[PDB]
């Protein structure tokens, strides 16, 4: 058995992010940190097979093999490294994985300007859709309470060229109820939303 | 290094299946996993060698053939609605300990093909007031009715195919969420320069890859065959 | 109402053989969508109506690939490349373009073997209807072609006559054969005043009537 | 598994009312239309309407306007055909057949699944319930008599199903008093009379007659 810790860790971009993994066979030889994106397969990044710490860029693993131990922190941790990391663990040249851990690096926010804009359709006028945007990662976006009603996620954005992150969820209902004012009325949206 | 093909498959239950792997490492050692979100990686069947096959933890309704060492298919015999998973195929030297994944394989086993849709996308233009407040302009995509959740959503830009200033939903919406067979949704954003979307000269295309059902298959409703297709919506650039 | 009508209404055809159903409406059938909604059904004897062809010439998943459908604008036919045994049945057009939907008369289906004459069996009365009253004696004649048959009954060598009711099964899916059962109903009092008990069967099969009885009352 | 398993066999008397059900499995129910159709005996099929048991959308052939209601019980998946002031021409099997266009698709103007048909007798005349009575036996014949019943139909059956291979159910024959009797036979090895046992199963639905009658060789 391999084991992990629990829940998905929310860390703040610049924070390490700190994983652990204790294995149960004490004849355990070789220990293993793969990384895993949302729909994408798991990818090797760490492998160590002593005592002591292991460095590779932003990656730290450490093993104890007395305390039957393993650990992984993502020093300077970037929105990036949001995925899910799994531990394994073998003997000789099976592989026993963990369940996972999910991490979430939150962006560094610093000049917020939180809006719900309203967007249309390239093709209708009549269709669009609510773009709550430009709010800091301290904001959490509540899924939908009604059926014909459909919220999605903050989700980060990255304009690599200028260093510029910006988080964002949309909205959207064909019920003849829904405005953009009272589509995100679910979550604690910040006092100063601009909305036009 | 390691390849499975195909990546995306919807099966009729009791139909067969045989996803493939093939490696080109010389590796000796070949396994199989199924990918669940309650309980992670679980191994169905493993290779020590040519020739050589053994049980994993879950073997039940899959055989695994081993005849040469690049190859190691996974045979789904009569498939069942238990088997809708994603699947892993690694290989591992087996003589260096490490284990290398392949791409994976997306798998839904329906009732029936009648649940399957292609998705419908539509992109909606920059908001005015985001433009002027913010001298940025933001591009959503919406994927929606799409069954199962094998899609492929990329933005592209005057022709190539675009990452910087995107994020599209990890997890796509049940539009039906009580339902097994709910038909989702997926949303996608691309934000831009104002300066940029001001330029009548750039397009901008949302493009969903689905994949569905074969031209082989048989079907009886008047709506089009929901077949493997790309379906997508555009914008053009506009000075207002 | 759109008339749906059929041509021919009985059709006999040897295994082997090709057939055709022709079906013809009193108006067009292209839907404002484009399609046109003419379909095929055959319903076997004692089940549910069966589809076939549906929108003209499309085949239904399951059905054999020697059916097939093609027509346009008021006529449309149905082909079996190849009739089997099993294709036994009755086969009607249908209209849904327009509503109300509409059928066609129907078109049997009857297929052609050689002559095979009746095994012939007889049974007297139970005793728990005996006591009751009543007697029926009863005639199976099983798995013979063609249809055409004549059963006699006689008591103590008197030939009967109003006494007796008979009913004959459709043609068979696997040996295109018919059946035919024939009861003979007479009060306990009479039954019991008579001791032969025989009921005579000709059939192309026979070359001579074959006699099934059995003694006691 | 798809099944449309109807109501069973009525007798109403001219001027009554009968509301056949017909109860869908295997399948998500609201997501596809369903017809009724109506064959009387020896003739063809006549669609009478539909009901879309998704929005309670109904369509009607102008013969039985004024007389036919179609409704739906989403909770049990059952769909309803009621026709009221029923005449001697009413006498039919009526059955349920499915649309084959799920969620909305033009598809439904053809029909997959049908089920097995109600038969409706109408007539002033009494229910009966039949009495069976053996037709003991290289090959034996051997067979059951349901004799005496009102109206229209009985299912007969041999070891609940286990035996059909030489099965042969005659169509029933209408007796002077007005009441039907029919025949079940069934050939069997001559070799095997005293080794396997033989049970007939007859059901007749309108008077809640189930009889499994044993046959046994004089
Ligand atoms: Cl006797
Ligand atoms: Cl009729
Ligand atoms: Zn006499
Ligand atoms: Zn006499
Ligand atoms: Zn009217």
């Given at each position: 058995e391999v084991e992990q810790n629990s829940g998905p860790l929310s860390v703040p971009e610049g924070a390490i992010a700190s994983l652990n993994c204790t294995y149960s066979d004490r004849g355990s030889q070789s220990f293993f940190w793969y990384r895993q994106y949302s729909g994408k397969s798991p990818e090797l990044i760490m492998s160590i097979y002593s005592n002591g710490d292991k460095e590779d860029g932003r990656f730290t693993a450490q093993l104890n093999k007395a305390s039957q131990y393993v650990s992984l922190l993502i020093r300077?941790?970037?929105?990036?490294?949001s995925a899910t990391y799994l531990c394994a663990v073998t003997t000789d040249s099976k592989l026993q994985f963990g369940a996972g851990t999910q991490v979430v690096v939150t962006p560094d926010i610093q000049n917020p300007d939180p809006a719900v804009y309203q967007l249309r359709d390239s093709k209708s006028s009549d269709k669009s859709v609510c773009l709550f945007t430009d709010?800091?990662?301290?904001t959490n976006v509540s899924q939908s309470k009604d059926s014909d009603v459909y919220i999605t996620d903050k989700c980060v954005l990255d304009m690599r060229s200028m260093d510029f992150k910006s988080n964002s969820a949309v909205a959207w209902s064909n019920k003849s109820d829904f405005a953009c004012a009272n589509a995100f009325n679910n979550s604690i949206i910040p006092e100063d939303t601009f909305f036009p | 290094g390691v390849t499975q093909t195909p990546k995306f498959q919807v099966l009729k239950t009791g139909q067969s299946m045989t996803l493939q792997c093939a490696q080109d490492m010389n590796h000796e050692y070949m396994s199989w996993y199924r990918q669940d979100p309650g309980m992670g990686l679980r191994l169905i069947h493993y290779s020590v060698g040519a020739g050589i096959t053994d049980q994993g933890e879950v073997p039940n309704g899959y055989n695994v053939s081993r005849s040469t060492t690049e190859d190691f298919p996974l045979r789904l015999l009569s498939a069942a609605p238990s088997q809708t998973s994603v699947y892993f195929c690694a290989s591992r030297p087996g003589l260096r300990p490490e284990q290398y994944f392949g791409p994976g394989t997306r798998l839904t086993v329906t009732?029936?093909?009648?649940?399957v849709f292609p998705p419908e996308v539509a992109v909606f233009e920059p908001s005015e007031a985001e433009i002027s407040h913010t001298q940025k302009a933001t591009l959503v995509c919406l994927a929606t009715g799409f069954y199962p959740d094998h899609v492929e959503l990329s933005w592209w830009v005057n022709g190539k195919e675009v990452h910087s200033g995107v994020c599209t939903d990890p997890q796509p919406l049940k539009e039906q969420p009580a339902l097994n067979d709910s038909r989702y949704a997926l949303s996608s954003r691309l934000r831009v320069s104002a300066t940029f979307w001001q330029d009548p000269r750039n397009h901008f295309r949302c493009q969903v890859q689905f994949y569905g059902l074969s031209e082989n298959d048989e079907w009886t409703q008047d709506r089009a065959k929901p077949v493997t297709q790309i379906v997508s919506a555009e914008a053009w650039g506009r000075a207002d | 109402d759109i008339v749906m009508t059929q041509s021919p209404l009985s059709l006999p055809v040897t295994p082997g053989e090709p057939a055709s159903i022709s079906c013809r409406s009193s108006q067009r059938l292209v839907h404002s969508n484009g399609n046109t909604y003419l379909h095929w059904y055959l319903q076997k004897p004692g089940q549910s109506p069966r589809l076939l062809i549906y929108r003209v010439s499309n085949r239904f998943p399951g059905?054999?690939?020697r059916f097939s459908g093609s027509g346009s604008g008021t006529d449309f036919t149905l082909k079996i490349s190849r009739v089997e045994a099993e294709d036994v049945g009755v086969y009607y057009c249908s209209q849904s373009t327009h509503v109300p939907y509409t059928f066609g008369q129907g078109t049997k289906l009857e297929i052609k073997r050689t002559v095979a004459a009746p095994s012939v069996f007889i049974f007297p009365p139970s005793d728990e209807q005996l006591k009751s009253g009543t007697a029926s004696v009863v005639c199976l004649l099983n798995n013979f072609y063609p249809r055409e048959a004549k059963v006699q009954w006689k008591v103590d060598n008197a030939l009967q006559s109003g006494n007796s009711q008979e009913s004959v099964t459709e043609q068979d899916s696997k040996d295109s054969t018919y059946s035919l059962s024939s009861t003979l109903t007479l009060s306990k009092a009479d039954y019991e005043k008579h001791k032969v008990y025989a009921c005579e069967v000709t059939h192309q099969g026979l070359s001579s009537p074959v006699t099934k009885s059995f003694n006691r009352g | 598994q798809v099944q449309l398993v109807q109501s069973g066999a009525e007798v109403k008397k001219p001027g009554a009312s009968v509301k056949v059900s017909c109860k869908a499995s295997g399948y998500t129910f609201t997501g596809y239309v369903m017809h009724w159709v109506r064959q009387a005996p020896g003739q063809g099929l006549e669609w009478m309407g539909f009901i879309n048991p998704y929005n309670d959308d109904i369509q009607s052939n102008e013969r039985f306007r004024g007389r036919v209601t179609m409704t739906r019980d989403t909770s049990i998946s059952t769909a309803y055909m009621e026709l009221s002031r029923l005449r001697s021409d009413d006498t039919a099997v009526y059955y349920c057949a499915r649309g084959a266009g799920y969620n909305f698709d033009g598809a439904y103007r053809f029909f997959d699944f049908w089920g097995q048909g109600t038969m409706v007798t109408v007539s002033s005349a009494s229910t009966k319930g039949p009495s069976v009575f053996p037709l003991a036996p290289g090959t034996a014949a051997l067979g059951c008599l349901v004799k005496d019943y009102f109206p229209e139909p009985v299912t007969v059956s041999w070891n609940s199903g286990a035996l059909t291979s030489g099965v042969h159910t005659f169509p029933a024959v209408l007796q002077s008093s007005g009441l039907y009797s029919l025949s079940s036979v069934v050939t069997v090895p001559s070799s095997s009379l005293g080794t396997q046992t033989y049970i007939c199963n007859v059901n007749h639905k309108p008077s809640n007659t189930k009889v499994d009658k044993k046959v046994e060789p004089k």
């Open positions: 300077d941790s970037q929105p990036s490294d709010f800091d990662s301290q | 009732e029936d093909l009648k649940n | 059905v054999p690939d | -």
